[PDB]
Amino acid sequence: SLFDHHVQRKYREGRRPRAVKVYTINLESQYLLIQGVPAVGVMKELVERFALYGAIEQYNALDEYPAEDFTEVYLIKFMNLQSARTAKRKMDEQSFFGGLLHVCYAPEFETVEETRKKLQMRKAYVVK
Amino acid sequence: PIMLLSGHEGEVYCCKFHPNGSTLASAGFDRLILLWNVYGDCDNYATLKGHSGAVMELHYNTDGSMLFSASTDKTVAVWDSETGERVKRLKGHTSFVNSCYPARRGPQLVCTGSDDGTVKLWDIRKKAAIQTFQNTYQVLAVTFNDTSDQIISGGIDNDIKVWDLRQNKLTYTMRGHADSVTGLSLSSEGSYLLSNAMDNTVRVWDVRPFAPKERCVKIFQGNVHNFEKNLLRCSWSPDGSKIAAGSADRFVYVWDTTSRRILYKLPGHAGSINEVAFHPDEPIIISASSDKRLYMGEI
Amino acid sequence: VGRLGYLQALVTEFQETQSQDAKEQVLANLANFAYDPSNYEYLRQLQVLDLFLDSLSEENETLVEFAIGGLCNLCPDRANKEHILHAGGVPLIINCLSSPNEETVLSAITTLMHLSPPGRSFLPELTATPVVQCMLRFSLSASARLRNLAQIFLEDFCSPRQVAEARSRQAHSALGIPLPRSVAPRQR
Amino acid sequence: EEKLQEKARKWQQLQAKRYAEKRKFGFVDA
Ligand SMILES: *O[C@H]1[C@@H](O)[C@H](n2cnc3c(=O)nc(N)[nH]c32)O[C@@H]1COP(=O)(O)OP(=O)(O)OP(=O)(O)OC
Numbered sequence A: 001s002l003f004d005h006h007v008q009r010k011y012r013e014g015r016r017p018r019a020v021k022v023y024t025i026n027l028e029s030q031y032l033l034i035q036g037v038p039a040v041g042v043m044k045e046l047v048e049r050f051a052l053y054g055a056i057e058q059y060n061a062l063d064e065y066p067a068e069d070f071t072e073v074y075l076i077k078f079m080n081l082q083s084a085r086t087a088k089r090k091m092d093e094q095s096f097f098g099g100l101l102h103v104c105y106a107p108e109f110e111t112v113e114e115t116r117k118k119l120q121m122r123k124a125y126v127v128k
Numbered sequence B: 001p002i003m004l005l006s007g008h009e010g011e012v013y014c015c016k017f018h019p020n021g022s023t024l025a026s027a028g029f030d031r032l033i034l035l036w037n038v039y040g041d042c043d044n045y046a047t048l049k050g051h052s053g054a055v056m057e058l059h060y061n062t063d064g065s066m067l068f069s070a071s072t073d074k075t076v077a078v079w080d081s082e083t084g085e086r087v088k089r090l091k092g093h094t095s096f097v098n099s100c101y102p103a104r105r106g107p108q109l110v111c112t113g114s115d116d117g118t119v120k121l122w123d124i125r126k127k128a129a130i131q132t133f134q135n136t137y138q139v140l141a142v143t144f145n146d147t148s149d150q151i152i153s154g155g156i157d158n159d160i161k162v163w164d165l166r167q168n169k170l171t172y173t174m175r176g177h178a179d180s181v182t183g184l185s186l187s188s189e190g191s192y193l194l195s196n197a198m199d200n201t202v203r204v205w206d207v208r209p210f211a212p213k214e215r216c217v218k219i220f221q222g223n224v225h226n227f228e229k230n231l232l233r234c235s236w237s238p239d240g241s242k243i244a245a246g247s248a249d250r251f252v253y254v255w256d257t258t259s260r261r262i263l264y265k266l267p268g269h270a271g272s273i274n275e276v277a278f279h280p281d282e283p284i285i286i287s288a289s290s291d292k293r294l295y296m297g298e299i
Numbered sequence C: 001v002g003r004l005g006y007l008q009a010l011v012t013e014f015q016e017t018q019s020q021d022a023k024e025q026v027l028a029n030l031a032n033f034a035y036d037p038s039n040y041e042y043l044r045q046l047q048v049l050d051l052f053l054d055s056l057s058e059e060n061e062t063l064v065e066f067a068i069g070g071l072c073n074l075c076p077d078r079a080n081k082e083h084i085l086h087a088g089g090v091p092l093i094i095n096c097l098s099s100p101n102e103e104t105v106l107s108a109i110t111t112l113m114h115l116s117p118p119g120r121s122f123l124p125e126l127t128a129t130p131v132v133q134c135m136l137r138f139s140l141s142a143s144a145r146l147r148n149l150a151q152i153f154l155e156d157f158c159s160p161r162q163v164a165e166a167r168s169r170q171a172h173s174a175l176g177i178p179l180p181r182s183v184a185p186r187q188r
Numbered sequence D: 001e002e003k004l005q006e007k008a009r010k011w012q013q014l015q016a017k018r019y020a021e022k023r024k025f026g027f028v029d030a
Helices: A043-051 A083-093 A112-127 C003-014 C020-033 C039-044 C048-059 C061-074 C077-086 C090-098 C102-116 C121-129 C133-141 C145-155 C160-175 D001-017
Strands: A031-038 A054-062 A071-078 A101-104 B012-017 B023-028 B033-037 B044-048 B055-060 B066-071 B076-080 B086-090 B097-102 B112-116 B118-122 B129-134 B139-144 B150-155 B161-163 B170-174 B181-186 B192-199 B200-207 B218-220 B233-235 B242-245 B252-257 B262-266 B273-278 B284-289 B295-297
Touching: A031 A043, A043 A054, A043 A071, A043 A083, A071 A083, A112 C102, A112 C145, B012 B284, B023 B055, B023 B284, B055 B097, B055 B170, B066 B097, B112 B139, B112 B150, B118 B150, B118 C077, B129 C102, B150 B181, B161 C090, B181 B233, B192 B233, B192 B242, B233 B273, B242 B273, B252 B273, B252 B284, B262 B295, C003 C020, C003 C039, C003 C048, C020 C039, C020 C048, C020 C061, C039 C048, C039 C077, C039 D001, C048 C061, C048 C077, C048 C090, C061 C077, C061 C090, C061 C102, C061 C145, C090 C102, C102 C145, C121 C133, C121 C160, C133 C145, C133 C160, C145 C160
Parallel strands: B012 B273, B097 B139, B139 B181
Antiparallel strands: A031 A071, A031 A101, A054 A071, B012 B023, B023 B033, B033 B044, B055 B066, B066 B076, B076 B086, B097 B112, B112 B118, B118 B129, B139 B150, B150 B161, B161 B170, B181 B192, B192 B200, B200 B218, B233 B242, B242 B252, B252 B262, B273 B284, B284 B295
């Protein structure tokens, strides 16, 4: 639903163009959904590359997800949401094994208490 | 107590206990079948090699001399438990095979189900399928009654089906699952058949010559399925008093077959649990999971 | 050029234009600067909180969604939170539970949750409002995120005694039988 | 009925994906 890949555009235009999309605290998650991996059996190299950034609690490949041909979709659970943001920030639109790589937040998967801590930590950071 | 299990490289999907309670067999995604000493220092005896696909289901025959192994490579192997030599692999099936049950107390028979929608009856001495029950929906789990007359099959149609070997007809349909059935198993008495399903319902069904025509004998709860869509299997205790079924929430659930109270919820699995087995003599549970480790819980 | 000067330039760009898409870009940039802690003050000195509050009043759905998103990350700071409350924008947020889009509703819920103050400063307002009745339908919706938000919202802005009363009121509406306004729950 | 067929197709897709040969353990590169 929210996983659709929006498109880019003076406004003092920067080096790289950005699509119009505002990120709210709820939108952001610690579940990171990666789509566009080539279907060449790189399950473990991708996960190592992402584990470079933070610590990965859980990773699995969700095959039910509607994907294009010879292409894969993966889930990554991080430990700290700031780590998830930096992982998106740097990994998104990085050529990976011959394919464009698209990472999006996956808030559907997180449970009620996970949302509780997300919101509470957002309040903690904003207050200080 | 508690003994931990290490050695597996990939997810463990199934594990069984030898009929005489002296050894364990385990296998999963790593295509190896490992044998273990139940007592001593819980040592690893041998490794069965020869499956090219992943091992989806193990069984022992009632004598504990033959070990049956359904693999994703469309082949069902028959193994010698004593030497570890391969005996014979079933041929005929199309695509991935989900499960295989070996008939007890009768001349050697084997039943299989696969993603081709069919259920096949094998005589290990023929090297060819004996009967075929074509099902449009992929078949996930299959078991014989104690009389070796009927075949019980669980698929993705939410309907457990019973087949008559002589008539070759759809004898029985059981309604009561709202979603795919992933694991079936008969009571040691022949009296009751245990089912897991993606609807998070564990349901016992009673199969008898004289039945009530609405055999939803009991329903249990606790057992969760999730995005991993792993096949989930359940087992009866040796005496039919306890019911164990694995879940995707890291807990082994054990219930009281009568009152339906949760006797055990056992944390200690980092990932999803794929099969739970009871030792044939003593209250010992082997829990196998996707975290590649086994536990030998004692009750 | 200068950060605060740049934000002021965006404010001017927003005000002078009339093309709804060139306002879409402005509300995107503003809502995403609102995520910044340091840029809060810079926004506080330029009346752009009231810019957002006016922008919800506009009827372009995308623009309203952007404004709500900007609010959501913006409210939680104590200075900014008090300004928005004083404006009287709360009914503007209340109007957004009937907004059609999922995102806007989620943003509104988050903003309502954030406006929550310790010492029971604002809880009383929620009980009077019919928002609670709307929430029950939302909690049991198909969207997992919405369900999580609704349940979380109930703990934050409701009370067990209050919830029972709310449930009864919701039940009464379904029942079709009127409940006297004068009657109230009694402490035990 | 029809949703049963769509579910069966989706399950077949999932099995043809997760248990593909390319994911088999001990995958030699050569
Ligand atoms: O304002 C820009 C950008 O700064 C902001 N954004 C990107 N990544 C973000 C994050 O992790 N957290 C927040 N709060 N904001 C973040 O979003 C807009 C536009 O984003 P883009 O640079 O276009 O990236 P993306 O949103 O992923 O583009 P898309 O079409 O959705 O997918 C590649």
